[PDB]
Amino acid sequence: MDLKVVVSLSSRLYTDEIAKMQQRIGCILPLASTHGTQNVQGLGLGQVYSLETVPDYVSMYNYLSDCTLAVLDEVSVDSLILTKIVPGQTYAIKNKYQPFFQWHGTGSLSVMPPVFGREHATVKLESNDVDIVFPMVLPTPIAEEVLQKIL
Amino acid sequence: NRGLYNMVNEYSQRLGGHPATSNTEVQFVVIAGTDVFLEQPCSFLQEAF
Amino acid sequence: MKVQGSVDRRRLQRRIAGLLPPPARRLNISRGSEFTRDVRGLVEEHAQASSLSAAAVWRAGLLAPGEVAVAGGGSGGGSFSWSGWRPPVFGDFLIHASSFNNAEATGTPLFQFKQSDPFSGVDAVFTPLSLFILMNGGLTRMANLLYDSPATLADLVPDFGRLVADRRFHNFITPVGPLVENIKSTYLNKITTVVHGPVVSKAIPRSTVKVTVPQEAFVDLDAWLSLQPCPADARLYVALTYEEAGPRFTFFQSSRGHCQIMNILRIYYSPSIMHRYAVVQPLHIEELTFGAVACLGTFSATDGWRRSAFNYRGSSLPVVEIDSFYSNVSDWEVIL
Amino acid sequence: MKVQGSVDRRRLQRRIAGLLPPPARRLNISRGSEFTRDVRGLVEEHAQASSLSAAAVWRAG
Amino acid sequence: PTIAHGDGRRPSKQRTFIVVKNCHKHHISTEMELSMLDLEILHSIPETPVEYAEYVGAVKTVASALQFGVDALERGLINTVLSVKLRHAPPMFILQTLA
Amino acid sequence: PTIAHGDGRRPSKQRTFIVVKNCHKHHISTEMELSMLDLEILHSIPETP
Amino acid sequence: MASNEGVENRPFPYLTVDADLLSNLRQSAAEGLFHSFDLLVGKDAREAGI
Amino acid sequence: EADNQIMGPSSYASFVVRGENLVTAVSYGRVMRTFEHFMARIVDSPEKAG
Amino acid sequence: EADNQIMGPSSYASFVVRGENLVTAVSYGRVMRTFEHFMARIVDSPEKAGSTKSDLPAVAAGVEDQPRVPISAAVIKLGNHAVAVESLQKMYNDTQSPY
Secondary structure, eight states, X not given: OOOEEEEOOSSOOOHHHHHHHHTTOSSEEEESOOSSEEOSTTTSSTTTSOSSSOOOHHHHHHHHHHSEEEEEEEEETTEEEEEXXXXXXOOOOOXXXXXXXXXXXXXXXXXXXXXXXXXXXXXXXXXXXXXXXXXXXXXHHXXXXXXXXXX | OOOHHHHHHHHHHSOOSSOBOSSSSSOOBOSXXXXXXXXXXXXXXXOOO | OOOOSSSOTXXXXXXXXXXXXXXXXXXXXXXXXXXXXXXXXXXXXXXXOOOSOHHHHXXXXXXXXXXXXXXXXXXXXXXXXXXXXXXOEEEEEEEETTTSOXXXXXXXXXXXXXXXXXXXXXXXXXXXXXXXHHHOOOHHHHHHHHOOOXXXXXXHOTTHHHHHHHTOSGGGEEEEEEEEEEEOOSSEEEEEEEESSBOOOOSXXXXXXXXXXXXXXXXXXXXXXXXXXXXSEEEEEEEEEEOSSOEEEEEEEEOSOHHHHHHHHHHHTHHXXXXXXXXXXXXXXXXXOOEEEEEEEEEETTSOOEXXXXXXXXXXOXXXXXXXXXXXXXXXXXXX | OOSOTTOHXXXXXXXXXXXXXXXXXXXXXXXXXXXXXXXXXXXXXXOOOOOSSHHHHHHHO | OOOOOSSSOOOOOOEEEEEEOXXXXXXXXXXXXXXXXXXXXXXXXXXXXXXXXXXXXXXXXHHHHHHHHHHXXXXXHHHHHHHHHHHXXXXXXXXXXXX | OOOOOSSSOOOOOOOOOOOOOXXXXXXXXOOXXXXXXXXXXXXXOOOOO | OOOOSSOOOOOOOOOXXXXXXXXXXXXXXXXXXXXXXXXXXXXXXXOOOO | OOOSOOOOOOSOOOOOOOSHHHHHHHHXXXXXXXXXXXXXXXXISOSOOO | OOOSOEEEEXXXXXXXXOSHHHHHHHHSSOOOTTXXXXXXXXXXXXXXXXXXXXXXXXXXXXXXXXXXXXXXOXXXXXXXXXXXXXXXXXXXXXXXXXX
16 A cells, blocks of 8 residues: 655755754645645645644644645655555654644654644745645643643 | 763873973963873863872 | 667566565365365465464564564465565553552553653552552442452552543543553553554464453443334444543444434433532532543454453452454544 | 985985976076076976866876 | 563664764874085085095985984884873873763 | 956956756556455356356 | 754764673763763664665 | 657667665765766776777 | 783785775765775675675774784783783983973
8 A cells, every 4th residue: 555645846945944954854734635746835834834824723623634635754944744544543743833832652642723823834846936844743632731821 | 061971081081181281491381282292180080180 | 689778677577576476365265176276275374373482483474574474474465465464563551559459350451541740660550440449249348349449540540630620631541442461560550552453462372362341330222212224333432421420431332323323322421410419519610510531443343342240359240241342542522 | 223214315315306496587688698498497387277188187287 | 683572662773873083184294404615516516535535424424314203203103192192192080980 | 268458347256156956756546346246256267067 | 052063973884892892881871971962762763874 | 741650669778776886875865867977987997089 | 021022914904095095086075995805895795795705804894914024012901901011202202302
């Protein structure tokens, strides 16, 4: 079973933006299409969390529930390689999320939309004129306190 | 303050701080060490006898 | 001629030849033959062990890309879709050796209390009997034999007075799953359970593992309730119940469904809700909650949960045992 | 223990020879000869000018 | 490599270390003086036996100067080796117990 | 190259440009289906016509 | 600390030396004796693909 | 139409890393196109006008 | 002194940077040492094990098969060891510089 997804870029990335995205090599990105070759306009949340219109919490929630998640594995000058998350498989993730929360073994992790600043969730790719945005992954007991307090 | 082996290396391979002059009437501090063939074991311990 | 495109025929055929064949099912049967080389291959299931030799490892097929071993090395390799057998995910815990009694049934479901000291290195893990003595014939005589000086368990949970009062004790306890392996060490034991997977023994000569629950606590929700369907699966549940007498722990079995079960548990606990709500505690802010429920896994209906004794220290305890368990933990749902 | 890392004979033999000759001075005049190609070596002024050609530029110095 | 233990201690898997060392460079030089009279009478030719004796004196002097320089190079090479060793020799009252 | 001029211009020295071009990569993929009946009956020997 | 400056884990044809270098490793790595050193544990011990 | 047909190659032009290119790809990350030609122009036939 | 003399090489072992080394030095910033050995173990003979006897010649780019001479020093034996002992104070004095 093939889980690899190759994201090809229209234009080569700057030597700086490679350093930015490599720092986030192990983390979950939601994927528009489940097919093997893909575009760059798909993976970010820039569609739902965008600079031009007002963002909604209940709109990003509806998206992450339907969407297909993925894990970053390697970044090239002109490429992005991911592996889909599907049932009946065990994955190894890392936590690289700018507001830092400690994780615990044998716990329950939750994938919730970024309720902190944009700057913490985003990596701007000026070369392709898009920003890729990551969902935040909290331990569920932490995610509940954060929700009801900002609410 | 740095590592133990770093200190051991710097002991011999780097001149200590402001050592005294030799074969002079009084002892000045030496900036340029040509003859200088000295070594000071109390700078390590920080103890005087 | 021109080199056929970029793609090369007779080179993709070889590569796709490996991917094509699906696993074997629906073999034809002849009473004359009645046991064949064909019938064997369909039945053999390729155990995953070895004798520790570089040549013997290739024989068994441990060094294979898929998550499960395919025997014969490359031969018969590339099916990758066969009964969706998923290996178990084991968990490793480091325990105070005086906290865990070594004489445990090898299959008993475990529970981990989430400590509140940062950067620790040891964990607190409880059996159904440890939880009995902590929460304070039957379990009373047997649990006290296994665990004397209940103080050492009270030392692990220092807020237990506070937690059961605010009715938030359950969310710091996370179910982990049945025992699989236990190393017996003087100071810090090493316990291995199986979380989210077919509970299977890792010993060298294989033996079937069956999760065991004391019969005093286990309550068949399906018989107490007694056209209806007969489905394949049945599920095991736990209910932590804050009563007037004190917190309590019970296990349940039924194959109805989640929305139904949450209704049957409210009917089952109606006598005990009225009592607490009238005798001792009418009302307060935090003290409103009654209890929680979680699901511990799915086992086969129509079988499982035989009854047996647990013999230790010249005294027995009637215990039920479930076969072919598949550990699968969900979070706690408040019943009230 | 054989020869040396920086051998004196090898360096002194070739490199030293070019640096040694200093500009000539006080050549003695012989009335009998009255002029030689040697006296030209002392007098010559060695002016710096050329013809724009690869072979002439090298000749010019 | 490791040992396999019967205790609970979590095991170290296969481990490898990778170390990198670098060069250090050194320089050596010496100066010599040669007299202009010496050089000029060397590059001239003698016309009388007194000037020929002076000539052989000049050639001996220049050869001795070059030999002096070469010997200085050799002494300096041995000197720099010994000084590198001395730099990297830690003291004995440290090394005896640290070893 | 350059041109030599009698005017007052400041002389343009010998000039050379060094230029660099980089590769671009493209990926391509298709999907095909095969039914389980087809994938099965291919491997079992057929007896009847 | 200053982990690795010129360490390169490219696959090389490594020369096998009988001298035992494995006598001052975790002690030297712990405090610090090497300018640039890298520790590769577990799966990372393999040779990297070219 | 003038000629209504043309001529052209039928096979591709293959490129592989075989020898010193392989050893440089291992030891050194970089790889050279026509390593043999670079050798021929640097060491084999130097001081020759291109 | 158990020996009163030792035996050692009489000329230094060379390093020459001509060939594929030259090509890689011109094209890329790097120079390989024993490019021949790298190539022999990579492309000319892969899938070949590692042995110290097998690799001894390769690591022996030095004194291996260089002429032998006697060198005058005093040797002393401590236990299993045989160690030389020297003093260059004469080399420093006959130049009138501190030892």
